[PDB]
Amino acid sequence: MRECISIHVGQAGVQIGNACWELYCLEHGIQPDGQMPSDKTIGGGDDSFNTFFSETGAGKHVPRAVFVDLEPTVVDEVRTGTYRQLFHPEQLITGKEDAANNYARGHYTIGKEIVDLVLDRIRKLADLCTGLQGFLIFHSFGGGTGSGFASLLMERLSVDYGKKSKLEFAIYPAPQVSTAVVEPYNSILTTHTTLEHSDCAFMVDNEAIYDICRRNLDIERPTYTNLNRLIGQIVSSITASLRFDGALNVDLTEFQTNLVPYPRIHFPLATYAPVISAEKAYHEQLSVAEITNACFEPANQMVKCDPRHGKYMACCMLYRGDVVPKDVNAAIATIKTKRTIQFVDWCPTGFKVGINYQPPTVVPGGDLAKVQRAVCMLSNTTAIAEAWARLDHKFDLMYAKRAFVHWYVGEGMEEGEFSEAREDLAALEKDYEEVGVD
Amino acid sequence: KIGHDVDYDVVRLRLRQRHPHVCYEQAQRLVNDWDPPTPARSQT
Amino acid sequence: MREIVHLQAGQCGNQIGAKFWEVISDEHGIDPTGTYHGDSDLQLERINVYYNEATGGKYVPRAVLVDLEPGTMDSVRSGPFGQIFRPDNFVFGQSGAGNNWAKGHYTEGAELVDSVLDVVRKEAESCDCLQGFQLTHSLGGGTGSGMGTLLISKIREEYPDRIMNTFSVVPSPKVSDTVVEPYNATLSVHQLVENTDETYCIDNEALYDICFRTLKLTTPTYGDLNHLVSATMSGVTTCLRFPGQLNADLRKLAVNMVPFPRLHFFMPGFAPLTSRGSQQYRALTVPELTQQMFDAKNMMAACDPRHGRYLTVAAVFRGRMSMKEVDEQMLNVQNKNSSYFVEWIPNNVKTAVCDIPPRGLKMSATFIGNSTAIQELFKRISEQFTAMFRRKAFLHWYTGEGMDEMEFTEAESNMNDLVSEYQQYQD
Amino acid sequence: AKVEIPSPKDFLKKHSKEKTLPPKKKFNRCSPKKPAVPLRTDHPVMGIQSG
Ligand SMILES: Nc1nc2c(ncn2[C@@H]2O[C@H](COP(=O)(O)OP(=O)(O)OP(=O)(O)O)[C@@H](O)[C@H]2O)c(=O)[nH]1
Ligand SMILES: Nc1nc2c(ncn2[C@@H]2O[C@H](COP(=O)(O)OP(=O)(O)OP(=O)(O)O)[C@@H](O)[C@H]2O)c(=O)[nH]1
Question: What is the largest CA-CA distance in chain A?
Answer without folding.
Answer: 67
